[PDB]
Amino acid sequence: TGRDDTKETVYISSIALLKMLKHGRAGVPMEVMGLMLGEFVDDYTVNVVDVFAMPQSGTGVSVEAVDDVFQAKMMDMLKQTGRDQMVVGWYHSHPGFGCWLSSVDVNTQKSFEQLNSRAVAVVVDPIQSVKGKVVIDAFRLIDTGALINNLEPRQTTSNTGLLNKANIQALIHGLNRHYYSLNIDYHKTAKETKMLMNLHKEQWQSGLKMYDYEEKEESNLAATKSMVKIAEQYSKRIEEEKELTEEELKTRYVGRQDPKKHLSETADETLENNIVSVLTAGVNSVAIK
Amino acid sequence: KSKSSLDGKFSLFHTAVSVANGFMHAGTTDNSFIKANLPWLGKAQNWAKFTATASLGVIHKGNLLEGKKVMAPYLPGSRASSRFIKGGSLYGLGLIYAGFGRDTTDYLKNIIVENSGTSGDEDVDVLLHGASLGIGLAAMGSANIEVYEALKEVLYNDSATSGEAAALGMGLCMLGTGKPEAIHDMFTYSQETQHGNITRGLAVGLALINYGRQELADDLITKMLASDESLLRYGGA
Amino acid sequence: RHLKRELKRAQEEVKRIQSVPLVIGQFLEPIDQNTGIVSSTTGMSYVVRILSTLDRELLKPSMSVALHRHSNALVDILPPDSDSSISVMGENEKPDVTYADVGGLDMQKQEIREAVELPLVQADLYEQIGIDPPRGVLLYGPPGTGKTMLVKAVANSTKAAFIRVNGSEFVHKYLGEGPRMVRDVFRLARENAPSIIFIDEVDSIATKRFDAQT
Amino acid sequence: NDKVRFIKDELRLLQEPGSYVGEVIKIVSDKKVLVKVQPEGKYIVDVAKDINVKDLKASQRVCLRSDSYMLHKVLENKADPLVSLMMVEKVPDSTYDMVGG
Amino acid sequence: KAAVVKTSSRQTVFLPMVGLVDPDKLKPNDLVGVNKDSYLILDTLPSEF
Amino acid sequence: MSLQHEKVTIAPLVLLSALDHYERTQTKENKRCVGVILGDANSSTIRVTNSFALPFEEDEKNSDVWFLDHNYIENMNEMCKKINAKEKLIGWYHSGPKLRASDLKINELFKKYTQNNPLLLIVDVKQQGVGLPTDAYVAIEQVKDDGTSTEKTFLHLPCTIEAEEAEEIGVEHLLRDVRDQAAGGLSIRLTNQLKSLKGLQSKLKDVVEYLDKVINKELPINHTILGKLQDVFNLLPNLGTPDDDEIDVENHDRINISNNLQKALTVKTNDELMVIYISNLVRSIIAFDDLIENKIQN
Amino acid sequence: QVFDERIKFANQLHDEYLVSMRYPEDKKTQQNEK
Amino acid sequence: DKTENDIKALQSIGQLIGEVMKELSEEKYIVKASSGPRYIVGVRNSVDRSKLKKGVRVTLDITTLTIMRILPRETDPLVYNMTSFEQ
Amino acid sequence: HHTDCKFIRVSGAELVQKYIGEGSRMVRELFVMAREHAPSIIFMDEIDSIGSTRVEGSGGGDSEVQRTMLELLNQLDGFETSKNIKIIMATNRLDILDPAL
């Protein structure tokens, strides 16, 4: 019968993830562009080793803006280093709207389907993302033909599928009738993790430096006064507070913005701090002489 | 119910009906389901059609003698219309013949050696996935080393989806032996393979082979949990 | 102990959302204790989640409010004091204390003190006799008698709040833009009481006869 | 355990951009309602699936989503400037003997 | 060097003066072309009254 | 040249690039990867944005013998200018770890390109030193005393990382670790106090053995070090001083304040004791009433 | 020396609170309630 | 050099102007944008807290909405024309 | 106080309101809102000293918006039949008031 037609779990390296973020953010508002370099093996494995952002084009995402002079040139330099990788798709940002292929972009992505048969269009939306995690999705062309010939069920085998409910109407219609969405995973080695994880030794050298000690008194003093003012409302609150029905009590004795909670919070902050302050002061003194 | 509500063209639905029904009629042959749900059956495609032939073996569990007979047109040689049929019959045979006779293991063993080259042809990848699950089932608790060697050759070929099937198949055959040479090879290979399905297969196989292995699996557990891969930790557990 | 770390990290995440960038809106009325309706600066009416443990006592009175930009939700509240009416760039506060306000018209300087300084400073006195707080003060005379300066001096050194506005702040070219500032002055004073209201230009605003010719 | 869920859950709610507020002008025979989205123009937009057109009435103020504008929940209390004005003015405490003669 | 444009998009933008476009040629209340994405003074336009 | 070099901030991106590049050029058996570093310069903060490997060969037999490809440096410049124009050629990274005297010689070719003293960014690839995964060093030319010829030498500068906004935000989603230091709760910093002492102790012992090595193994005496150690003995608090007595007073106050905060927490914990009891008392009645009512109904 | 002890006494209070507190609650959760 | 100057501006990208509507804190400032909607923004570290004064014209990122720097007073044309005369 | 109704002071023109839409027709819309929020005493304070020129003139769009409100009290007769909306007006002088009253 038919081929599996299971969209690739797109293993987008940590290096590729950070790198789309830089180009895309700085380049606001102009919708940026570039190719994704990687390797496709098996039926559902693409690893995107690296990406590179093509020079800005004032035309915006267009068939104009995809260009082979840049394509050739970067790859020829990577020949010299042996870091050469084939074009396996393209990324761009729509930052002025969420992650979904435009009517113009579906024509464009089809050109790339001729180049490479497992070509992706990965829309990275940089302004609207607040963390570089949410509103980022991956796509791959599903023909017009598929829609007519009821071949969409073949297309979603061996997958869990991803729906983006938000953004509808039009946009959603186009999305459903153009591409297929699948989960995006981030792969990294643990040598990378250790780098990410790393800081310095001057990190702890700073952690042995001590503030001026009058300022520390200021904080201890302040806390005591701080807590006096909120201890009156707490004092008032528990005078009676026996009256039937909890919901009523919450308005009457101000159980919202809870004074009991707020007192324990301030006490506890100042307390953990003053244990570190006495400890550090003693450690330094005995250590040195 | 199955025909009326659940749609046969949609693949996920069709898998659910095939599995529920396979059990309904299990442990005695039944062709009642084929006949009732005949139009329904023609709709099938892709992996819905692999599951459709393998369903037959869950149904036909027991009645061992007539197990082979019914599966006769679907085998390779007698079928080359559809690779999903060819492959899902061999999985299907192995269900009936789970833990029973070793005359069956022999047949499947031939098919593995034939295709342990290039699984790069499209038909071959599907075929060889079923063959590999199939022979593992058939050889359960035999501790046939011949089987084990055959499924190594699939692994090292680095067949796309059959790599997983083979890895599982080893642990089902050699069930509970804790042969150390087997343990060493699997564990080491799983690091090399970058493709996750093959990796999952070997993680889980390492557990199977150490069935009832008690405190002699203790060497294995420390390595798998400490392995930085999430995959090996999952099978570690 | 494992769940303590999750909890702590869970609060940290919410602080990023709470943080800048933000956009100002104006909390309208409740629809419900824990869901309310707001209007933005952009005229759009958003029905928004009231995040847990926030202000309620004052939140429900139409009051100025902040909205997280990307969530378009009520993540934290502003004082009514925030977003003060259109008001003079320099200090309300008087930088001089040397004062010629003392040396000559001294009798009038005490009088102003009597009406204005004496209730705020000593509330106690008033409570015992039983009077209502003394009534407003109109200052009129020929100009070049330092009227706007004798009273300024007092506000400055009493160190009760001082709101110094002109009719020129209020005046507007639009439709209904003047009055919305006027409502803000009266309330703004109540919020931050004891409080001193002085409108320097009021002459211009008052007319002998009303007209609508233009 | 319960507390950490609540903090997380609130965060997940806030995510949804927009969310609006209209008023049903009328009910129509395809099972849609004509909404006047209060700042924006008019839109004809379906009822939520959960509530039927029998439940709704003329001039019902409603909440609205923003990703499809499909109705969310009916407003418990009518959004109108007048409501806020009452709040401020407060319940009269004055009586006839406050003013003598 | 710097330019305050008030756009026809009804926005107000403080943009780095493009160095290619001369400081001389430019003047207050010159009519000018401006790039559509990123707001920079792209070119100068015959004025209309 | 510019002497402005004060801090060198290094994006998490440069590090990821350099690792990857080292392993894709399959430079091994202490085959050096030498690649270019791009970013801003002639600033107090040098903002190190990116790196790309250059073709490179290093021969183990003799270290004078290496290749570096001139034209590649040139080709990259017009490409990188278009991509982001704030980038300039600023020097080269070395795989390290070792600090070579072949780096004086490589710096001289980079010195042709650069408008600053060539920035040598030693990005350790083995990551043995967990802390300091980076060293930064700038080529200077300075009058060497004792009637010796002017020397070109490497003076350490702060290589410490700061990160850009765009990079940082994604990194933070990935991790959830308590890292080397987060300064989190009490637990986290309490660990820190032990670790940090241990940092110092390590540092300190090495200074002790360095002094043996001057007089046993005849290192040329680096007088700079000796200068710093004089400042340590001299600005060393002296004990028996009445300053120490003052210190003890400050200690007395804070330990007291802790005691008063401890008591206030007792009042909070004590309130919870009663409220839960109140609740139990009502519930006893709720459950009793179930039993009697089930009997009556039946 | 004096103050060190006073802290320990408060802590000992807290513990006494915590243990006792939970013993009625067991009873009630186990009992049926309306 | 002249043509290279355009490449460099392109990466700079435009900015939005408001004005310091009211100081509330050193940490956070309330600005009212000239085009419209009032925003609460953050301060950048090189710009000083005291350069910031009420009524000073400020420039801010479009993207992050964070006060980059003070601008000189960007006078209305009417008062700009009176200054402009040298007789 | 004794009547026990919602005493909503609306002081002045509702051209001050500008929250949604123009404030002009919000004057007129008062009827609708008072009905929903009954029991209500609408205390319309408005002296009508916005110009003597338009008190005695034919000019004045303020006069037009005012007028459309008065008509709603006698076309719709929502307030009259089931009285719970009292229309309490207050002007300093009987003689500076609009003559349609």
Ligand SMILES: Nc1ncnc2c1ncn2[C@@H]1O[C@H](COP(=O)(O)OP(=O)(O)NP(=O)(O)O)[C@@H](O)[C@H]1O
């Ligand atoms: N305590 C005072 N006694 C006498 N004259 C005063 C006093 N204080 C200020 N002056 C004088 O008043 C002049 C103007 O002060 P100013 O504040 O303008 O007054 P005013 O009466 O409010 N009138 P106007 O300028 O019309 O608002 C000064 O130039 C002083 O000479």
Ligand SMILES: [Mg+2]
């Ligand atoms: Mg005056």
